[PDB]
DNA sequence: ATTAGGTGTACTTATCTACACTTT
DNA sequence: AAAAGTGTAGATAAGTACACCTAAT
């Protein structure tokens, strides 16, 4: 048995059944009337079934070589979910703290970090990979970027450590010119007039590194505390298992493409209902998906996406984890959420999209209002998002270059047959 | 601003925020809440519509109405 | 019982309610709220009508309707 | 200075200033925020101005002589509101009991009483002459039908002292058969639907009277008290003062026919906004109205329309002292609220009425519709009232009869004309 | 140069005033 | 001897969509 504290109340309780191995959810009056579930799968009521809960439990862990990391600090078995909670339970995605009964480290401290201790990581010690190479065959969103959660005040960072929490997250790049596409991505992004997370790049030693703002936390400044914020991701909204993140979720074989039991657009629009404002849930959601489109994210999944958990209802996060990969192609390029049954973003066309809207039960209209938007705006956007650099090589120059130019490529190309859209016949 | 009892005019006002709120375009919102934008604007001036179209707007924006001795 | 969110079925069926509660025929109230009592049917079934037809039976029977981070 | 107390409860102050002579009313916050007004022209943020708490008071007094009785048990001036309403404040129409600060003298009894001590008031003063005032009066305040509020268990009769009230209202029949007349109208009212006060023939010794069940007093049967509920006429509702009852308030005289500042049908009508249900008002108002003409009372006036004030909203009283004036010669045949500017019964025909609908912006389908069924109604009705009558005399009878041909008569005659009112031009 | 708007046919629909129907 | 709740029909009137164009900032 666990307790489950958000913040400094404890909102209820997970309870462990060793011997029949489930798990259960049980909440406070006190929250029942005035708060919200971890997710729509585990209600206020405690009607939450094992299955959702060790489901939700599982989505909070790491899906990288990572994970095996916790196996090397913890003595547990990997089929144990509660035990790995457990470790990581005072700071995980979402506000939710894991807290065994009778305990607290309130008046803990903080661990400055100078760059030569986070340039040691990069030398791989105590830290993935090992273990350098992608993949078995073609990847992707492991191993080959490492991260690290800290606490960043605006000019240091430390390691959170008791109650205090990470309020940044720090991603590290070896793989080619990565922070580069995040960061153009993602300011690109917040150009365009989307809500998306606030990136800045940060220097360690002679590397490069995206400095990510956390939303769900929110640190104060002139005492103390890390506040955070409830949220979940469509993976835990629809109630699926982490091998669902992808719509097709027994990979990218050939025998098994026709099989897609993950997240889809569909089941992603599903969850409009739940929202406190569904239209503007779907806007975002589709400007979501054209964004992806337009900026070839083929990476954009289930837990690319989330949603912060209110009393009222959810409300969608600002995005994050926006990544071009059409740049790479010693990676998967087809998408994680296909259009319409296509997968292949070559394949795309009037009739993928017009099929698409029309399979949300949506105008068409309205793609092409929101497509044309975007694609028209991305010139100059993107010309503005480069300036936001810091020096560079010739490689990283070259690669912006070509980054600008099958941006501007794939722009052009939706711009063609965006008018023949509304004539299609599905 | 009204908690007041709502009238014809007063729920189209308050329709009218509530799409502002999310800063959604007139013809967005319309499209999504599967309506033209002309409709959703006679809607917000008070303007008679359709019940129907009230609720579709309504629902769409997730906006919810409900129903208000011896001595 | 009363539903607390309304939908266009629910207000029909508050308002039929509400007259029956007053004891007052179909054709008498409609007339009173100056609608024909058809048009106070088509209300009532929930089917699709004018904006101001609901607001001229609604405010007639004295019903009234209202709009309901961090840790 | 008087509290003003509500069954047993404080719900404010009635304040008199003498100096200033000026009334105010101000009200505990626990009734402001959960309770109801006196009456709409006196509201609970004690805004309510001298003259209206002036007018509300008067309307409470006797309008009769009795008046002049309350005058002689008081010994005070007819210019005094204040002394009266202190003196019969423990008993008045509505809940309100007006008790001057922490004085109560009751313990409150039974006094019983016998027809003995009936017939020595049916008999000479204990004063009811009282003619003649002034005067040769004709409209229904002319003259005395003598009546006495007291308590009724369902078979003794009794005085009210203290917090304890009289459940029923006594009255006694002086002029010819007035208490048959009463009772048939108002039993006719019950037969036909309407909303109407329960109403029984009581004897004592030879004489016969009219007990009326007080509709805004209710007793508990197992114990002893009084449940009062309280209400306003439309004098008060309306905010005019007690000579303002009748639609011409200056009198009968073809000089005044012109001026009516008094109480009139669309000014009654006015009062269904502030109802808790405006449309059933109005539909108890109309049929107020249509039965009051089919039965021929000329001396339905402001003080005979009330209404139960409650925190939602007013609510329609069941109708009371409804008498047929067309058998009475000797009193004023007119209307006290006139037909669109028609204050003569015999003139009413399909225009006034079409006008008259047309006045209130109402359909005249409705008014035909509730014309027509009572009309009808009322020949298989009034043979059913007169089975409820006790054992009569030839002179009785002849009154009855004379009753039923009048009200047949009546019903014909508007059934003649009721078609055409649809298309009248008016 | 974008959002909140007014146009324009062609279309679909609610409203009204009676009559007449199926059940008390 | 109905009453209240239903539908029917022509006729009036009015909403919806669909896309083009306006006026400002």
Chains 1, 4 share one sequence.
Not at chain 1, 292 to 312: R, V
Not at chain 2, 19 to 26: G, H, M, V, Y
């Amino acid at each position: 048995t666990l307790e489950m504290h958000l913040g400094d109340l404890m909102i209820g309780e997970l309870s462990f059944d060793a011997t029949a191995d489930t798990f259960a959810v049980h909440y406070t009056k006190d929250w029942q009337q005035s708060g919200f579930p971890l997710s729509p799968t585990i209600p206020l009521d405690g009607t939450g079934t094992s299955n959702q809960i060790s489901m939700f439990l599982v989505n909070l862990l790491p899906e990288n070589k990572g994970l095996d990391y916790l196996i090397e600090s913890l003595g547990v078995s990997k089929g144990n979910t509660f035990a790995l909670i457990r470790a990581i339970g005072l700071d995980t995605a979402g506000a939710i703290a894991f807290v065994p009964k009778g305990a607290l480290l309130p008046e803990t401290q903080l661990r400055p970090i100078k760059a030569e201790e986070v340039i040691q990581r990069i030398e791989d010690p105590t830290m993935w990979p090992m273990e350098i190479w992608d993949g078995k065959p073609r990847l992707s969103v492991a191993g080959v970027q490492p991260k690290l959660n800290l606490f960043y005040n605006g000019k240091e960072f430390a390691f959170a450590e008791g109650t205090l929490s990470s309020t940044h997250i720090v991603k590290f790049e070896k793989y080619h010119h990565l922070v580069i596409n995040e960061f153009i991505t993602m300011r690109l992004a917040k150009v365009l007039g989307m809500n998306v997370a606030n990136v800045d790049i940060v220097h360690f030693g002679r590397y490069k590194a995206l400095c990510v703002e956390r939303f769900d936390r929110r640190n104060i400044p002139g005492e103390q505390r890390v506040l955070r914020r409830h949220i979940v991701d469509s993976c835990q909204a629809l109630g699926f298992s982490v091998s669902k993140k992808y719509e097709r979720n027994f990979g990218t074989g050939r025998d098994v493409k026709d099989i897609r039991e993950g997240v889809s657009f569909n089941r992603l629009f599903s969850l409009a209902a739940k929202c406190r404002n569904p239209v503007a849930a779907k806007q975002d959601m589709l400007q979501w998906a054209l964004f992806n489109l337009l900026t070839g994210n083929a990476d954009a999944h289930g837990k690319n996406y989330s949603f912060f958990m209110t009393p009222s209802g959810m409300e969608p996060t600002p995005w994050y984890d926006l990544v071009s990969v059409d740049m790479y192609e010693d990676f998967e390029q087809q998408l994680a959420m296909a259009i319409d049954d296509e997968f292949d973003p070559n394949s795309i066309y009037a009739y993928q999209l017009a099929a698409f809207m029309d399979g949300l039960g949506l105008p068409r209209n309205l793609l092409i209002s929101n497509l044309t938007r975007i694609a028209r705006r991305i010139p100059q956007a993107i010309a503005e998002v480069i300036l936001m650099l810091p020096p560079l090589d010739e490689d990283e120059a070259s690669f912006v270059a070509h980054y600008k130019t099958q941006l501007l490529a794939r722009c052009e190309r939706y711009l063609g047959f965006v008018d023949e859209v509304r004539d299609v016949e599905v | 601003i009204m908690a007041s009892p709502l009238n014809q005019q007063s729920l189209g006002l308050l329709i009218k925020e509530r799409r502002k709120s999310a800063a959604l375009t007139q013809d967005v919102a319309a499209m999504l809440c599967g309506v033209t934008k002309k409709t959703l604007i006679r809607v917000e001036k008070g303007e008679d519509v359709y019940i129907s179209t009230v609720f579709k707007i309504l629902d769409g924006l997730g906006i919810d109405i409900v129903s208000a001795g011896w001595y």
